[PDB]
Design an enzyme around this catalytic site. Structure first.
Site, PDB file in Angstrom:
ATOM      1  N   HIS A 165      51.567  38.645  14.503  1.00 58.21           N
ATOM      2  CA  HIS A 165      51.899  40.085  14.593  1.00 58.21           C
ATOM      3  C   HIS A 165      52.576  40.434  15.916  1.00 58.21           C
ATOM      4  O   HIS A 165      53.055  41.570  16.092  1.00 58.21           O
ATOM      5  CB  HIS A 165      50.628  40.881  14.361  1.00 58.21           C
ATOM      6  CG  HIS A 165      49.559  40.680  15.401  1.00 58.21           C
ATOM      7  ND1 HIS A 165      48.558  39.726  15.417  1.00 58.21           N
ATOM      8  CD2 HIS A 165      49.400  41.360  16.548  1.00 58.21           C
ATOM      9  CE1 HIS A 165      47.850  39.835  16.569  1.00 58.21           C
ATOM     10  NE2 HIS A 165      48.362  40.868  17.264  1.00 58.21           N
TER      11      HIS A 165
ATOM     12  N   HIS B  11      51.443  36.632  22.726  1.00 64.80           N
ATOM     13  CA  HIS B  11      50.473  36.829  23.814  1.00 64.80           C
ATOM     14  C   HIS B  11      50.843  35.881  24.942  1.00 64.80           C
ATOM     15  O   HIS B  11      51.094  34.662  24.705  1.00 64.80           O
ATOM     16  CB  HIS B  11      49.065  36.534  23.303  1.00 64.80           C
ATOM     17  CG  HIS B  11      48.533  37.580  22.444  1.00 64.80           C
ATOM     18  ND1 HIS B  11      47.319  37.490  21.821  1.00 64.80           N
ATOM     19  CD2 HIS B  11      48.987  38.815  22.151  1.00 64.80           C
ATOM     20  CE1 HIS B  11      47.037  38.608  21.169  1.00 64.80           C
ATOM     21  NE2 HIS B  11      48.072  39.472  21.330  1.00 64.80           N
TER      22      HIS B  11
ATOM     23  N   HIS C  57      50.814  41.436  26.874  1.00 65.50           N
ATOM     24  CA  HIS C  57      51.609  41.481  25.655  1.00 65.50           C
ATOM     25  C   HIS C  57      52.316  42.809  25.513  1.00 65.50           C
ATOM     26  O   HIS C  57      52.093  43.667  26.394  1.00 65.50           O
ATOM     27  CB  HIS C  57      50.725  41.138  24.437  1.00 65.50           C
ATOM     28  CG  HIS C  57      49.684  42.163  24.163  1.00 65.50           C
ATOM     29  ND1 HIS C  57      48.355  41.923  24.413  1.00 65.50           N
ATOM     30  CD2 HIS C  57      49.780  43.409  23.698  1.00 65.50           C
ATOM     31  CE1 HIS C  57      47.678  43.029  24.108  1.00 65.50           C
ATOM     32  NE2 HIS C  57      48.541  43.970  23.700  1.00 65.50           N
TER      33      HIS C  57
ATOM     34  N   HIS D  54      53.952  45.932  22.634  1.00 66.76           N
ATOM     35  CA  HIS D  54      54.092  46.521  21.327  1.00 66.76           C
ATOM     36  C   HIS D  54      55.489  47.108  21.274  1.00 66.76           C
ATOM     37  O   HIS D  54      56.002  47.583  22.304  1.00 66.76           O
ATOM     38  CB  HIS D  54      53.040  47.552  20.963  1.00 66.76           C
ATOM     39  CG  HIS D  54      51.631  47.075  21.089  1.00 66.76           C
ATOM     40  ND1 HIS D  54      50.859  46.777  19.964  1.00 66.76           N
ATOM     41  CD2 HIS D  54      50.907  46.745  22.184  1.00 66.76           C
ATOM     42  CE1 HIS D  54      49.670  46.343  20.438  1.00 66.76           C
ATOM     43  NE2 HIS D  54      49.681  46.267  21.756  1.00 66.76           N
TER      44      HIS D  54
ATOM     45  N   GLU E 172      52.617  52.709  21.870  1.00 65.53           N
ATOM     46  CA  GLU E 172      51.326  53.089  21.238  1.00 65.53           C
ATOM     47  C   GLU E 172      50.896  54.458  21.754  1.00 65.53           C
ATOM     48  O   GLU E 172      50.742  55.409  20.959  1.00 65.53           O
ATOM     49  CB  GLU E 172      50.332  51.947  21.458  1.00 65.53           C
ATOM     50  CG  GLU E 172      50.785  50.661  20.814  1.00 65.53           C
ATOM     51  CD  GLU E 172      49.628  49.813  20.314  1.00 65.53           C
ATOM     52  OE1 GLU E 172      49.502  49.671  19.095  1.00 65.53           O
ATOM     53  OE2 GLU E 172      48.831  49.382  21.151  1.00 65.53           O
TER      54      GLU E 172
ATOM     55  N   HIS F 155      51.041  45.947  27.772  1.00 65.92           N
ATOM     56  CA  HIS F 155      49.576  45.942  27.975  1.00 65.92           C
ATOM     57  C   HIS F 155      49.212  44.769  28.848  1.00 65.92           C
ATOM     58  O   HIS F 155      49.530  43.621  28.472  1.00 65.92           O
ATOM     59  CB  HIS F 155      48.843  45.851  26.650  1.00 65.92           C
ATOM     60  CG  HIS F 155      48.963  47.107  25.851  1.00 65.92           C
ATOM     61  ND1 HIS F 155      48.708  47.222  24.460  1.00 65.92           N
ATOM     62  CD2 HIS F 155      49.282  48.361  26.306  1.00 65.92           C
ATOM     63  CE1 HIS F 155      48.898  48.508  24.145  1.00 65.92           C
ATOM     64  NE2 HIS F 155      49.240  49.214  25.254  1.00 65.92           N
TER      65      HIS F 155
ATOM     66  N   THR G 129      43.612  48.335  20.282  1.00 62.72           N
ATOM     67  CA  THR G 129      44.485  49.100  19.397  1.00 62.72           C
ATOM     68  C   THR G 129      44.792  48.363  18.099  1.00 62.72           C
ATOM     69  O   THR G 129      45.527  48.904  17.266  1.00 62.72           O
ATOM     70  CB  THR G 129      45.796  49.482  20.061  1.00 62.72           C
ATOM     71  OG1 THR G 129      46.541  48.303  20.338  1.00 62.72           O
ATOM     72  CG2 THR G 129      45.573  50.273  21.329  1.00 62.72           C
TER      73      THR G 129
END
Ligand SMILES: CCNC(=O)Nc1ccc(S(N)(=O)=O)cc1
Ligand SMILES: [Zn+2]
Length: 257
Positions: free
Chosen positions: A61, A64, A91, A93, A103, A116, A196
């Site tokens: 998804h 990392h 990582h 998003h 996010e 993050h 999250t």
């Protein structure tokens, strides 16, 4: 199992992870007229040792970047914390187009991506696996990424992606200090929240930076060109991995500024 598709994505996570509808879920919309300045918040202190960088992993998804976390070479202190938190990963998003992808939002504004930087409480706990389900166990710095000029600080990360194109691939990723990715100002918001994505544990103290960092349209494209499939299967690009904002449920977002 879970993902970001229509069948397995955020609006369905509650079927297997009922904490998805909990009182401490992340991310949130930060309404600046509702934040409370807290005189007691100390400046954020990050001190990371580049020798702790370990590995980059395609996790299907997302990807990392993991760090060695056997000692306190790389730590976060200050802000709202009394404890030292040990770096373990960073990582990103992103979304399906530049219009969304962060996010957290600020006053309803959606950024193009979010960084993050994640840590666990080594003062109280002995491992990430112990810490991850504890209310005080995790600390994540979030940085909103505003589409604009190419960010040269991302180069090593972007250059690594060609070795981890498909799910499960991993490669060494060494000699890198992720504090180089943070904005100049460490002025921040903080609130008690959650991971999250599944398992969505309500274990994260969030530190959201007020200043954004840049990313170009083409850098975002590189993230979306990572593949969620395993090698040899039909290619399924990683088009997005951002959760919608969740209700504050009476939490207070504190400001350091
Ligand atoms: C508990 C396992 N989590 C892990 O390895 N990385 C992770 C995953 C998600 C988050 S988040 N998106 O910062 O809530 C923080 C850290
Ligand atoms: Zn994240």
């Amino acid at each position: 199992d879970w993902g970001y598709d229509d069948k397995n994505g955020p609006e369905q996570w509650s079927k297997l992870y009922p904490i998805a509808n909990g009182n401490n879920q992340s991310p949130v919309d930060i309404k600046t007229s509702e934040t409370k300045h807290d005189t007691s918040l100390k400046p954020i202190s990050v001190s990371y040792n580049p020798a702790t960088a370990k590995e980059i992993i395609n996790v299907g998804h997302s990807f990392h970047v993991n760090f060695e976390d056997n000692d306190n070479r790389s730590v976060l202190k200050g802000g709202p914390f009394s404890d030292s938190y040990r770096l373990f990963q960073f990582h990103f998003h992103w979304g399906s187009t530049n219009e969304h992808g962060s996010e957290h939002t600020v006053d309803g504004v959606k950024y193009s991506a979010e960084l993050h930087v994640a840590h666990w409480n080594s003062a109280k706990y002995s491992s990430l696996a112990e810490a991850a389900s504890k209310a005080d166990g995790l600390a994540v710095i979030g940085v909103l990424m505003k589409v604009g000029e190419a960010n040269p600080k991302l180069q090593k990360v972007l250059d690594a992606l060609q070795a981890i194109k498909t799910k499960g691939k991993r490669a060494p990723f060494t000699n890198f200090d992720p504090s180089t990715l943070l904005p100049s100002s460490l002025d921040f918001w903080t609130y008690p929240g959650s991971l999250t994505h599944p398992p969505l544990y309500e274990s994260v103290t969030w530190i959201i930076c007020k200043e954004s960092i840049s990313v170009s349209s083409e850098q975002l494209a590189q993230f979306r060109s990572l593949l969620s499939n395993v090698e040899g299967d039909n290619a399924v690009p990683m088009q997005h991995n951002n959760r919608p904002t969740q209700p504050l449920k009476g939490r207070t977002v504190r400001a350091s500024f």
